[PDB]
Design a protein around this ligand. Structure first.
Ligand code: 99B
Ligand code: 99B
Lengths: 205, 204
């Protein structure tokens, strides 16, 4: 288990997201699904020149898995995944000028996605976020942060995932509506209706 | 014809795009198709609760029309379109904060789209851009700029388009590769392959 400091502007953005009231919190689900769709585009693109890219799983889909008992909402996709370097250095698409431009714009939250930092909208609803991921060129890894300016990365020893990413939202006690089948369906319908991959809700036992 | 000053940061971005060398200029086509797709999503959504939104045209598609004779590449869609207010005031999504700071990311051009200003990438390859558009709530208008700090807006009493937008790129003389059928196919394949509306390339 290695522990890292957030890039300064990411820490600032995270505090802003957590410590300020925003009405329109449902957009977190749109942003996560958007990222999953972009990850699916990426592996599909690679698979057109080299079909062996799909040895790790041919299916291209997004699954939403609410769990009232654990107070978790999980977004799973079979996209390209992230390597250890991605998890430690951050993605190329998250640049500090974009992070800065968004925060300036803040002072609607929904504009977050435009600037490449949509993932951090998860902290509108989640007290902790766990990201389990597997990229064809690397091993399976877990990234986790409860904000407060640090995050962790470790090799993952849980269930193998083949290829793709699970983001596990450990929800805030006042944000449990997002575990409700009805609410989830309404949000997907409003914001993610024309995404070009199946989105399937796994109804809880 | 009314002539309008560009917002100051928009003028600066435009001068920058025109007056700086960039290698990977082909991404302009990715940005335009992305906007057309976003505009298609918008009218589609509206039509779900009001079917009459499609009385101006049921088809939801994107057309690419190269014209070697006129040296123009036109990107046409049947998306939601833009009102006169949109054309004069700009879109609410193009914000000083994103414009001022995309320049900061530059100080690759390809991340322009992030910052909400993907359209202006048209000026990597075009000396003039004409935008003809029709929204359900307004008349048909033409916006046009050759840069130099201004744009014009006029009623378009030309060809009725029903609903949607045409972006006509009047290409610089050293940028004519973007009228070649095979170059356009390759750009679509690399960047826009999984857009969720038909993209039709119309032989001249
Ligand atoms: C595959 C790429 C993309 C198309 N999709 C996704 C993108 C993301 C996403 O934003 N991850 C990251 C990288 C990691 C995991 C969450 C957050 C942002 N992290 C980090 C990592 C590091 C830092 C730092 O300050 C380092 C000091 C510099 C900050 N933050 C996610 C989570 C999923 C998908 C998807 N479902 O596939
Ligand atoms: C429907 C909106 C979006 C989803 N799609 C599109 C967006 C655009 C686009 O960016 N247009 C604008 C508004 C007009 C036309 C081009 C440029 C950017 N203009 C202006 C207008 C004004 C200003 C100013 O400085 C004013 C002083 C404040 C600057 N620039 C386009 C072109 C097409 C689509 C699409 N195919 O539908």
């Amino acid at each position: 288990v290695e522990t890292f400091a957030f890039q300064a502007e990411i820490a600032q953005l995270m505090s802003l997201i957590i410590n300020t009231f925003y009405s329109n919190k449902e957009i977190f689900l749109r942003e996560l699904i958007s990222n999953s769709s972009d990850a699916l585009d990426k592996i599909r693109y690679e698979s057109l020149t080299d079909p062996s890219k799909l040895d790790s799983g041919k299916e291209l889909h997004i699954n939403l898995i609410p769990n009232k008992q654990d107070r978790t909402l999980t977004i799973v996709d079979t996209g390209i995944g992230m390597t250890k370097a991605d998890l430690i250095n951050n993605l190329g698409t998250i640049a500090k000028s974009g992070t800065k431009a968004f925060m300036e714009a803040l002072q609607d939250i929904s504009m977050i996605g435009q600037f490449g930092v949509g993932f951090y909208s998860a902290y509108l609803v989640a007290e902790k976020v766990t990201v389990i991921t597997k990229h064809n060129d690397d091993e399976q890894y877990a990234w986790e942060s409860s904000a407060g300016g640090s995050f962790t990365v470790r090799t993952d020893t849980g269930e193998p995932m083949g290829r793709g990413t699970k983001v596990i939202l450990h929800l805030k006690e006042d944000q449990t509506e997002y575990l409700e089948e009805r609410r989830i369906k309404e949000i997907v319908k409003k914001h993610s209706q024309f995404i070009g991959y199946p989105i399937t809700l796994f109804v809880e036992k």
